[PDB]
Amino acid sequence: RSLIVTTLLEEPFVMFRKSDRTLYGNDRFEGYCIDLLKELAHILGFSYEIRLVEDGKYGAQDDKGQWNGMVKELIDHKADLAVAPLTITHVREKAIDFSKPFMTLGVSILYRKGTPIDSADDLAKQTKIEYGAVKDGATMTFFKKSKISTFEKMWAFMSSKPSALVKNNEEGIQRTLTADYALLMESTTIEYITQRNCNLTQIGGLIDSKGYGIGTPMGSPYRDKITIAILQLQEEDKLHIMKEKWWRGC
Ligand SMILES: CN1N=C(C(=O)O)[C@@H]2[C@@H](C(=O)O)NC[C@@H]21
Ligand SMILES: [Cl-]
Ligand SMILES: [Cl-]
Ligand SMILES: [Cl-]
Ligand SMILES: [Zn+2]
Ligand SMILES: [Zn+2]
Ligand SMILES: [Zn+2]
């Protein structure tokens, strides 16, 4: 049977490809994670149907501990694979399985160009420049859970001021372009955006380190096969090639 792949529109990972007509099925999509999926389907010899996650979320918990997003789709066995920039986290590992990472990254800062700012520290110890993160994203959770001084402080700011947190990267990137606002997000998106928007830039370096993995329901037989396939793609340099294909723009 074809595998059900849950995913989520997110540049440059998964996008509707441009067309004069209306496309349907898998042919609708293009992007880094679509190329990854094609590589995985070939190596492992499965067929698949792409389905965008209904609630358009990656996956977070509520106060009662219930999951939404692609994480939930896997938990309920409504999808066999999550092929997306799904950040590997301690908490998510308790609910689903991940392949080994296919991409490594970290939290960093998106901000308009040309300022005294050079680091998170510069950002926390001042007040003129607002800053925030996507609400309930892996990046926000990092600041919430942190015990580091400068990040407990930043979490204090972004959690008190109820305009600091944005609904998604799209809105957050809007804010950096219209207001005096710095977005806390993942370095993969920042590199993509700053290659295409020469008025934006990354502030400082990576403040943590993490990876993206293919999500499967806990105990899936495919997890280990996907890990083997990712290792093969690494050996063949195809993750390098795929990244340069979809990260290119100053
Ligand atoms: C592009 N994204 N940025 C994020 C962030 O948390 O900064 C999200 C994270 C997740 O899986 O929650 N990885 C994909 C999303
Ligand atoms: Cl076409
Ligand atoms: Cl769909
Ligand atoms: Cl999370
Ligand atoms: Zn190949
Ligand atoms: Zn089941
Ligand atoms: Zn290479």
Keywords:
37% helix, D-Maltodextrin-Binding Protein, domain 2, alpha/beta, 4-stranded mixed beta sheet, 250 residues, 10 helices, binds ligand 8VE, Glutamate receptor ionotropic, kainate 3, binds zinc ion, 13 strands, binds chloride ion, 3-stranded parallel beta sheet
Short description:
With 250 residues, the chain is an alpha/beta fold. The chain is built from ten helices and 13 strands.
CATH class of the largest domain: Alpha Beta
SSE order, as H and E? Answer: EEEHEHEHEEEHEHHHEHEEEHH
Write down the overall geometry: globular
The radius of gyration computed from the alpha-carbon positions, rounded to a whole number of angstroms, is 18 Å
Count of alpha and pi helical runs: 10
Q: How many beta-strand runs?
A: 13
Number of domains: 2
PDB class: membrane protein
Keywords: ionotropic glutamate receptor, kainate receptor, ligand-binding domain, gluk3, glur7, agonist, membrane protein
Assembly: monomeric
Entry title: Structure of GluK3 ligand-binding domain (S1S2) in complex with the agonist LM-12b at 2.10 A resolution
